Amino acid sequence: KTHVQLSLPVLQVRDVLVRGFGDSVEEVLSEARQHLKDGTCGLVEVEKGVLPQLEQPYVFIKRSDAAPHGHVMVELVAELEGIQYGRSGETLGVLVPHVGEIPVAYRKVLLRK
């Protein structure tokens, strides 16, 4: 399937134990996709002060369309030193590995895979 229904645990930035997916744009997009497939991917909502507490490159989920079955359609955009790889809509948040942190919410998305 080109799209997969996912329920992503929303994590508080200060709870996150592993603050990025790796060291290159290509690696972080790779690792993000692997963690999404394996159900080991969390979502941090972006506000003032959040991104400097996480490791670059960043992987964002961005709204790709204006929401089947409650699931917002999203795609992955990476960012490294202010350059984005991908073009998409509004940020739903930044993806991080999930290693058992307790979430504050869940975000239903339809991921373009």
UniProtKB/Swiss-Prot annotation:
<comment type="function">
    <text>Inhibits host translation by associating with the open head conformation of the 40S subunit. The C-terminus binds to and obstructs ribosomal mRNA entry tunnel. Thereby inhibits antiviral response triggered by innate immunity or interferons. The nsp1-40S ribosome complex further induces an endonucleolytic cleavage near the 5'UTR of host mRNAs, targeting them for degradation. This inhibits the integrated stress response (ISR) in the infected cell by preventing EIF2S1/eIF2-alpha phosphorylation upstream of stress granule formation and depletes host G3BP1.</text>
</comment>
<protein>
    <recommendedName>
        <fullName>Host translation inhibitor nsp1</fullName>
    </recommendedName>
</protein>
<feature type="region of interest" description="Disordered">
    <location>
        <begin position="1"/>
        <end position="113"/>
    </location>
</feature>
<feature type="domain" description="CoV Nsp1 globular">
    <location>
        <begin position="2"/>
        <end position="113"/>
    </location>
</feature>
